[PDB]
Amino acid sequence: AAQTNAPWGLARISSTSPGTSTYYYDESAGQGSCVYVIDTGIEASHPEFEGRAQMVKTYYYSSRDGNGHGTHCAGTVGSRTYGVAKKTQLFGVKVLDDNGSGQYSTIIAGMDFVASDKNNRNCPKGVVASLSLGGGYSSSVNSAAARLQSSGVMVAVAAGNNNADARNYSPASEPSVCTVGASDRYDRRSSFSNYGSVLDIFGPGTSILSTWIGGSTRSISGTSMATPHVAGLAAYLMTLGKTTAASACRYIADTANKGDLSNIPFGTVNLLAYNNYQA
Hints:
It catalyses: Hydrolysis of keratin, and of other proteins with subtilisin-like specificity. Hydrolyzes peptide amides. This protein is an alpha/beta fold. The protein has a single domain, classed as CATH 3.40.50.200. The chain contains six helices and 16 strands. Strand 10 and strand 11 form a beta hairpin.
């Protein structure tokens, strides 16, 4: 399959080198795995989804998504057009306020909730979760990902805007999960990317065009956005039948484009993610 003039992210991961606008991917397309959008949830009534989206839990009053960045990244996970895993089902948790922030009680809550929910949904191919989130180191929030990870849910966590070493930040810091950094179209680590030995991968995170609340669609900037790309990709590949939840984070890392990046400070990884699709 070959969806064209594609968001550079999608195009980049389909391709061993930059300067291409076509997302190639399988027929499967991530059909039948589950992805766990842990953000400000989703506006599933957006056309792009076709009703593969649903708000499964909301630690707030209104399931309906307010901020949008939540929905946005669900779009990059698996909308029809902007999505990596175009055929996947998508499950909004709402752990965040509609002005971005939210309590660590309530993230851990929602990290613990997907460990539950995965039984209550049908995820033969396997569950993924995205945490386009984090803040200061907190051993709990890290355990709240390794606990989630130990369950057989592939967790993909963002590294952060802060241009530090990601070691300071949770749930990025965690050993077991997939920390993700962000490339720009010219294969430079974006300067808003958080780096470190901890990391295992760089997605596309600079200027990603995806869905947006109120039916619209737009382009935003963040490692936040690099996460689904890997998430939707791990959804894509657990579907193709190429890993468990616990082995994906390596197999994504093992089958990546080594030494493709510029702006890689010493210690940090030099991988960019790649769907490896012999078209």
